[PDB]
């Protein structure tokens, strides 16, 4: 829901034809901190078999 709100925030400033860019940057760093918390939640899953190996390969693909 945070990721959908920034693209709602994006699509209205592209709808117009100052202050919106710092609202975007503050909302950019807000969901970056939550995906890093999501990145730790994947790696703290069960300390188990390949369902942690699949979601690890999600995490390195999002890193490079």
């Amino acid at each position: 829901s945070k990721l959908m709100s920034v693209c709602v925030m994006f699509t209205n400033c592209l709808q117009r034809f100052e202050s919106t860019i710092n609202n975007f940057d503050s909302n950019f760093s807000a969901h970056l901190m939550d995906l890093l918390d999501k990145l730790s939640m994947y790696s703290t899953s069960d300390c188990e078999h390949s369902m942690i190996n699949i979601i690890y390969r999600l995490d390195f693909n999002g890193f490079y």
Binding site: R57, F60, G62, F63, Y64
Partner: protein, 436 residues
């Protein structure tokens, strides 16, 4: 729905689009004058995305072909694939043009046939109520494709503002300068319109064509009959997600959106390996997908003349690797596993990169459902070497007093030469600045 109007224009742009439509009938299982095979609907699940939609199961091409030279169109009507084309959409019989060889000819002919050039090409626009965009299948070589093609990049920008523009433009040849000498002038005038009056381009070098045309094709005398074979396959290869049923980036505004970093940085490097017919006898033993993308990032299939020692300070940002037909998708994630270990693509130090791989089933045909095909759409920041090559050949020609008195008699009163020079250096400086 997703209808695209191709704008075939010029002496070279009409011939590369002639076999592009001729390639499409062999893979759709259709004939240009009839429907003799039932493979068109059971095998292919979508056909009305480049063709006009059917009235008698006759898929009309959504194509327009204008050129000053009548020689390119007189080699069309005797071929049996011209009955698929219509003699009322573009021109009837005995169409002509100028004399004619000038960039200022077609630039001045656009506003004297302004009523007719915006009349019959707009009849195909309102056929579908949701138009995709316009692709200018034009040329940079000569004054025919470069003179008139710069005019439509301006007047279609505001009359159709919500449409995608992106071109498959071919670059001219820079080997000697005897037959043509106006090559640095007409190229840079269109190259300014390709960045600010156009969103994206697809570059196609001419000096890199004969690098491949003698690589595996084994010819002794290079003719113009080989220039349509490398070009028409990768054109139909680029729409395999769009013509054949795919899921992600199945539109032309899907593929180009995931590769462009910024405006005026849109020059995409192209690669395509399989062009040899004697590979067919050894693809019966399950040739896999694990070996076909190791050679895409390796600079062997590239169609861009660039420096070999300039790739260490340049970084890839977006790289596309399109597999077609038989993929064996249980090992396509295995092919992308081996990418991070080599680091054959230099990654930008300021932001993330992306290696996007996609697949779509090919035509129900024996050379298509047997041999693996790899289409590359790269984006590397060593493309300024061509822009350094064209600019160094541009300022050297203006100090030799070449075509400064022979070019400003018609419709040129002020010096617009440094208007092209600074905007080209703006592209060359923002490319190196883009990796901070």
């Amino acid at each position: 729905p997703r209808e695209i109007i191709t704008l075939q224009l010029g002496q070279c742009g009409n011939q590369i689009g002639f076999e592009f439509w001729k390639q499409l009938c062999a893979e759709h299982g259709i004939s240009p004058e009839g429907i003799v095979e039932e493979f068109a609907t059971e095998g292919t699940d979508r056909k009305d995305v480049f063709f006009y939609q059917a009235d008698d199961e006759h898929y009309i091409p959504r194509a327009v072909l204008l050129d000053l030279e009548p020689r390119v169109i007189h080699s069309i009507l005797n071929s049996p694939y011209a009955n698929l084309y219509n003699p009322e959409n573009i021109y009837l019989s005995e169409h002509g043009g100028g004399a004619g060889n000038n960039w200022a000819s077609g630039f001045s002919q656009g506003e004297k046939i302004h009523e007719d050039i915006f009349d019959i090409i707009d009849r195909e626009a309102d056929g579908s109520d949701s138009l995709e965009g316009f692709v200018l299948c034009h040329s940079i070589a000569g004054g025919t494709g470069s003179g008139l093609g710069s005019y439509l990049l301006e007047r279609l920008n505001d009359r159709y503002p919500k449409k995608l523009v992106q071109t498959y433009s071919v670059f001219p040849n820079q080997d000697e300068m005897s037959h043509v000498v106006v090559q640095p002038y007409n190229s840079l005038l269109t190259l300014k319109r390709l960045t600010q009056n156009a969103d994206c381009v697809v570059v196609l070098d001419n000096t890199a064509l004969n690098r491949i045309a003698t690589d595996r094709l084994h010819i002794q005398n290079p003719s113009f009959s080989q220039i349509n074979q490398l070009v028409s396959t990768i054109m139909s290869a680029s729409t395999t997600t769009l013509r054949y049923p795919g899921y992600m980036n199945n539109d032309l505004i899907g593929l180009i959106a995931s590769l462009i970093p910024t405006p005026r940085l849109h020059f995409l490097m192209t690669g395509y390996t399989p062009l040899t017919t004697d590979q067919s006898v050894a693809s019966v033993r399950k040739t896999t997908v694990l070996d076909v993308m190791r050679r895409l990032l390796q600079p062997k299939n590239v169609m861009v003349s660039t420096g070999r020692d300039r790739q260490t300070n340049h970084c890839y940002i977006a790289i596309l690797n399109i597999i077609q037909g038989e993929v064996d998708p249980t090992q396509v994630h295995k092919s992308l596993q081996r990418i991070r270990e080599r680091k054959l693509a230099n990654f930008i130090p300021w932001g993330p990169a992306s290696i996007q791989v996609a697949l779509s089933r090919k035509s129900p045909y024996l050379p298509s459902a047997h041999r693996v095909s790899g289409l590359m759409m790269a984006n590397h920041t060593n493309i300024s070497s061509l822009f350094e090559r064209t600019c160094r050949q541009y300022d050297k020609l203006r100090k030799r007093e070449a075509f400064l008195e022979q070019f400003r008699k018609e419709d040129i009163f002020k010096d617009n030469f440094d208007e092209l020079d600074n905007s080209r250096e703006i592209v060359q400086q923002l490319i190196d600045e883009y990796h901070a």
